[PDB]
């Protein structure tokens, strides 16, 4: 059947983007500015060891089990006059969570065992640089159910509810625990788990609550 491809890039200069564009024109590949459920490939700017910075496209590419590949894939494919294999250029890590964690590969191979399967997540209060609905999409892609209001968690013993907050975007986030029994964690719990494609322990991300 058909090859299926639709590409975005992340962290590229306009000159580097124009090489992607030339590569996409040569091989007849769709290239868009925004990531969507159609996207198959995220082309990250990396160093020579395939380490990138963490952008929203990085997180969403990993979350969707997409090909998250170095820009070197493009440059080397131009030089070789053919589309090279993605496995040879896959992003290995990032400047926050580790240079060789292999989160992208882990996610691509783990879509039948998603990191937040069995969790219900409320993305609560203000976020910066990342609209609430994009954080909600990210966690859904990773197998969580999303709730919009605390009240609508529910229900018995095995849950498990989790409230995610970005304190520095905000007082109020210290009094959530007096209302519901769910652990309250920083947004870094989500981002770190997604980049590593490994559900992190809550402990270091818990936001101390007023008794």
């Amino acid at each position: 059947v058909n090859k299926r491809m639709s590409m975005v890039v992340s962290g590229l200069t306009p000159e580097e983007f124009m090489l992607v564009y030339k590569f996409a024109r040569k091989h007849h590949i769709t290239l868009t500015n925004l990531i969507t459920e159609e996207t198959t490939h995220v082309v990250m700017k990396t160093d020579a060891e395939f380490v990138c910075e963490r952008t929203l496209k990085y997180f969403l590419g990993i979350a969707g089990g997409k090909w998250v590949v170095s820009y070197f894939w493009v440059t080397q494919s131009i030089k070789e006059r053919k589309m090279l294999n993605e496995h040879d250029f896959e992003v290995r890590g990032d400047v926050v969570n580790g240079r060789n964690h292999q989160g992208p590969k882990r996610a691509r191979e783990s879509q039948d065992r998603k990191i937040f399967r069995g969790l219900e997540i409320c993305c609560y209060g203000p976020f910066t640089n990342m609209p609430t609905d994009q954080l909600e999409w990210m966690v859904q892609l990773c197998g969580a159910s999303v709730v919009k209001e605390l009240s609508s968690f529910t229900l018995g013993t095995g849950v498990h509810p989790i409230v995610v907050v970005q304190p520095d975007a905000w007082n109020g986030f210290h009094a959530i625990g007096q209302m519901c029994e769910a652990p309250v964690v920083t947004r870094e719990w989500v981002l770190d788990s997604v980049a590593l494609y490994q559900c992190q322990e809550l402990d270091t991300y818990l936001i101390p609550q007023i008794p």
Partner: peptide
């Protein structure tokens, strides 16, 4: 414009 980074 410029994509935000998450340090």
């Amino acid at each position: 414009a410029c994509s935000p980074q998450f340090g």
